[PDB]
Structures are given as C-alpha cells and as structure tokens.
Amino acid sequence: LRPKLSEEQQRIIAILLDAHHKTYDPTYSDFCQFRPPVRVNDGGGSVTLELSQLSMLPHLADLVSYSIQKVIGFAKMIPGFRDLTSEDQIVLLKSSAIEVIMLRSNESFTMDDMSWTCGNQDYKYRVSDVTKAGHSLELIEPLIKFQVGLKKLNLHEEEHVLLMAICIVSPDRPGVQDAALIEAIQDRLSNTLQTYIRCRHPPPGSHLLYAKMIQKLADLRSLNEEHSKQYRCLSFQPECSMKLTPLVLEVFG
Ligand SMILES: CC/C(=C\C=C\C(O)(C(F)(F)F)C(F)(F)F)c1cccc(CCc2ccc(CO)c(CO)c2)c1
After folding, report:
1. 24 among the known binding-site residues?
2. Cα distance between residue 195 and residue 167, in whole Å
3. Which residues bind calcitriol?
4. What distance in angstroms lies between residue 79's CA and the mean position of ligand 1's atoms?
5. Terminus-to-terminus CA distance in the chain, angstroms?
C-alpha cells in the first residue's frame, strides 16, 4: 500500500524544508567570520604536536558553535518541538547536537576527494584538518565512512530534513521527562518519512530506504559516544577553553 501524504504531512515537510533553507547556507558565506583556520606541518599525524598546537581548533570550534546555533534555530521550527518543556527541549538539543551536525555536514561532504568542501583551499576540511583540531582516527575514520554511506543513500532534501528532525526528537535520550510526548512527535515525523519514501522515492529504493536511514541514526549514537570521549581528552589540554566557545563548552562539557 502506498497511502498519499496527508495535508498535515505535506505541511510538515514544507515547514521542515523552509526551516532548513533558513538555517543552512549552501554558500558558507559566514565562514570567513570565524577565527582563521591554521594548518601546521604534521605529515606524521603526531598526537603530541597536534595537542601542543591545536592549530585548527579555534576555526573548527567556531564552525561547530555556529552550527549548533543553526541547529537550535532549525529545531525550534520542528512541528511540535515548542510543545515540549524548555527542560526537555534543551536536553534533546544538547544530546543530539553533534549528531545533527554530522548529518547536516553531509551537504558539504564530497566523495570527489572525501572532504567537507566549503569554499577554496582555506575552507576545505580533510581528515588531516580534524586531527589538527585534537581528534584521533578512532573518530574521524568512522565518521568518513558514515558520510560516504549517507551520501550513497542519495536522499531527497525532504528525507534529509526529516532525518535531522527525527534525530533531534528522540525519546531515548538521558534526562528526558515526557518521553511519551517526544515519542508522539517523533512518530508523526517517522510516519511522514515512511509515507514520503513509499510514494515519492523512485526505485531502486522505493523501499528498504527507511530501514537504512534508521540504521544511520544508530550509527550516529556510536559516533556521538566516541566524540564525547575525544572531547573529554581534548578538554584536558591546558588553555583549550580559550580555543573553544561558551556554547561548545556548555553543550559538550
Ligand atoms: C570530528 C567531528 C566534528 C567536530 C568536532 C568538534 C569539537 O569536538 C572540537 F572541539 F574539536 F572543536 C567540538 F566543537 F564539538 F567541541 C565534525 C563533524 C562533522 C563534520 C565536521 C567537518 C566540518 C563541517 C561541520 C559542520 C558543517 C555544517 O554544520 C559543515 C558544512 O556542511 C562542515 C567536523
């Protein structure tokens, strides 16, 4: 059966697409406002050198901080999100932050050279740039694999924004109070996504796509955990706080 999208589901998709268009700048025009990227010589991927310099951290931290602000903006536009208490809203935002950033960054990710390309050489981010910010291959390699896998799903923008919404409105996040309400909102979103795939996504992929998308959400949980561990290590580096931002410190601290 291929039921048609209800008027409510059509509205949801329209709202989410609009929300994304208002919070994701495909030209990355604000990136020049961040502290400048600095790339020190580290062909050997020396952890000691990377930690002593953290050359790319100010720039990446500003980019992630900027991204978190956009995600907060996007989340506020998710139908039903504002029906949640402020406490639950913040809990969901802090816990899904890095995951949603990983998902949204897929738009700049390119398989041409496996990088996040946001402009000229200066704003092209490779595995080496992320290691220069203090992260290790234990996170980066799996992240790249995740980006490629997501790219290969060839998601429609409608599916992309629904996936980000579903990621944010997860009832299984530690600290949530009204799990039932959150689950109701997520179910409304998941049903919209399943209905959309069944009647708008052409084969080969009309089906099976939903399961693959849900598996990406599970993958994100593992990446989230690894990122938290790496952030912990990074925070132990003296003077690291100045290289971050108040928003980043609160969300991951
Ligand atoms: C390895 C994971 C990570 C960031 C980690 C950052 C921090 O741990 C620290 F400290 F290092 F700064 C933080 F800030 F969290 F604390 C990361 C995840 C996904 C991508 C990228 C690459 C860059 C890119 C990001 C976001 C968007 C859009 O938001 C776009 C443009 O699409 C490009 C990096």
Report:
1. yes
2. 18
3. 24, 67, 104, 108, 135, 227
4. 26
5. 47
How far is it, in rounded angstroms, from Cα 210 to Cα 166? 12
108 is in an annotated binding site: yes
CA gap 116, 108 in Å, rounded = 5
Strands 124-125 and 109-110: what pairing? unpaired
* Nearby residues of 63 by Cβ (< 8 Å), 6 or more positions away: 31, 34
Residue 119 lies in domain: 1-253
Instruction: Specify the CATH number for the domain of residue 172.
Output: 1.10.565.10
| 156 is annotated as contributing to ligand binding | no
208-213, long-range: CB < 8 A, 24+ apart: 209/153, 209/159, 212/153, 213/153, 213/155, 213/159, 213/163
Of all helices (H) and strands (E), which one includes residue 181?
Answer: helix 179-200
For the CA of 107, the closest atom of ligand 1 is 32
Ligand 1, atom 26, residue with closest C-alpha: 105
What are phi and psi for residue 155, nearest 5 degrees?
-65, 145
State whether residue 76 is helix, strand or coil: helix
Tally of structural domains, the chain: 1
Note the resolution in Å, 1 decimal: 1.8
